[PDB]
Amino acid sequence: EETRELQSLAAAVVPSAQTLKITDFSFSDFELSDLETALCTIRMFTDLNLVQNFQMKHEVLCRWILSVKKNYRKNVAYHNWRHAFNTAQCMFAALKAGKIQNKLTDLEILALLIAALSHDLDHRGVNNSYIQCHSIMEHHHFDQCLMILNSPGNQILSGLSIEEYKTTLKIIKQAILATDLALYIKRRGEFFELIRKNQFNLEDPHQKELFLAMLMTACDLSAITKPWPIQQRIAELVATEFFDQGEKKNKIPSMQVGFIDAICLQLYEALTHVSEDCFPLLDGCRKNRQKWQALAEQQ
Ligand SMILES: O=c1c2ccccc2oc2c(Cc3ccc(O)cc3)[nH]c(-c3cccs3)c12
Ligand SMILES: [Mg+2]
Ligand SMILES: [Zn+2]
């Protein structure tokens, strides 16, 4: 069946980005089959000029995508392939519609897309954090990412020179490590402070790296920015994994507001300053806060 899935994917035509709706910040994957998410992923690499600029063979990219998808656990309610897929779609949208693409190099864009898709590989559920803060989980996710990138027939970075390769792996590693909320909390102050004093400069290597980390977090948490009906469903999945280990929702509203205020709002507000075109993420996050708050006050 696996080889059958690869055949089907490899031979299928890839619809335009417009048709796949991957340029929209409000994108949802609920109506898509796994095969369709694989197609959207190919379009992301294609439209970001990655397939061309790095000479990726169609057969290899397809196999790599399927290996990545296969290495997420479907039995985990939220931290699964759909989450990684959505994180990558948000990166694509931020780069295109958010106009962030022009602010980065091709290697950085290549690393960001790969990281987004690979950032939660082999996640076993928040409650099943069984071992055998240096973000131990993120290190495992990266290890899985590297293993797949080095698997025979899955080497989508074979077209890069060794120097490009080492640079890309480093960015990929930092990007995945950045998805550790402890690191976000630890580094956001500097980012907020720089934007505050209007001293933010992407030309500065340290600030460029800091920005890449913040962007990863923004895409990682982007479910919190989706249209209300979508966000409710995503929150339902997170709740399932967190509680149902896969009162009740009488506390979810307040916790959602707590999460939005403590982690999300500031980040999307900062992102909008760096690029006004990313406003929809902030707008969606604000609309969901209002909705959750109304419920928290008992509707
Ligand atoms: O993603 C996270 C999250 C990630 C890492 C660590 C903690 C996190 O907490 C999140 C919440 C708070 C929450 C509140 C009530 C629940 O039943 C479940 C979760 N909502 C979310 C949601 C994320 C996106 C839409 S809702 C949370
Ligand atoms: Mg993670
Ligand atoms: Zn994640």
Residue length of the chain: 299
Residue 108, token pair as written in the block: 């950085």
Q: Is 79 known to be catalytic?
A: yes
Contacts 24+ apart (CB under 8 A), 124-131: 124/73, 124/76, 125/73, 125/76, 125/77, 125/79, 125/241, 125/245, 125/246, 126/79, 126/241, 126/242, 127/241, 127/242, 127/245, 128/245
Establish whether residue 237 lines the binding site of ligand 1, counting it when its CB lies within 6 angstroms of any ligand atom.
Answer: no
> Quick one: CA torsion of 62, 67, 68, 69, rounded to 10 degrees?
90
Angle CA(250)–CA(221)–CA(230) in degrees, nearest 5? 60
First-to-last CA distance in the chain?
A: 48
What experimental approach yielded this model? X-ray
Residue identified by tokens 């025979």 is: 152
Residue nearest to atom 18 of ligand 1 (CA): 239
Contact 168, 108 (CB under 8 A): no
Residue nearest to atom 17 of ligand 1 (CA): 239
Q: Mind listing the domains of the chain with CATH numbers?
A: 1-299 (1.10.1300.10)
Residue 267, token pair as written in the block: 């980040």
Contact 168, 111 (CB under 8 A): yes
Residue 188, token pair as written in the block: 């956001």
In order, the DSSP letters of the chain are: -HHHHHHHHHHS----HHHHTTT-TT---TT--HHHHHHHHHHHHHHTTHHHHTT--HHHHHHHHHHHHHTS-TTSSSSSHHHHHHHHHHHHHHHHTT--GGGS-HHHHHHHHHHHHHTTTT---GGG-----TTHHHHHHHHHHHHHHTSTT--TTTTS-HHHHHHHHHHHHHHHHHTSHHHHHHHHHHHHHHHHTT---TTSHHHHHHHHHHHHHHHHTGGGGS-HHHHHHHHHHHHHHHTS---HHHHHHHHHHHHIIIIIHHHHHHHHHH-GGGHHHHHHHHHHHHHHHHHHT--
Contact 218, 267 (CB under 8 A): yes
Give the separation between CA 91 and CA 288, rounded to whole angstroms.
Answer: 20
Residue identified by tokens 């909008």 is: 272
Residue identified by tokens 């995508």 is: 65
Instruction: At 3, give phi and psi (nearest 5°).
Output: -65, -25
Give the separation between CA 292 and CA 298, rounded to whole angstroms.
Answer: 10
Closest-lying ligand to the alpha carbon of 87?
3
Q: Which of 135, 209, 143, 201 is nearest to 171 (CA)?
A: 209
The residue type of 185 is I
Give the separation between CA 225 and CA 217, rounded to whole angstroms.
Answer: 13
Establish whether residue 295 lines the binding site of ligand 1, counting it when its CB lies within 6 angstroms of any ligand atom.
Answer: no
Closest-lying ligand to the alpha carbon of 137?
2
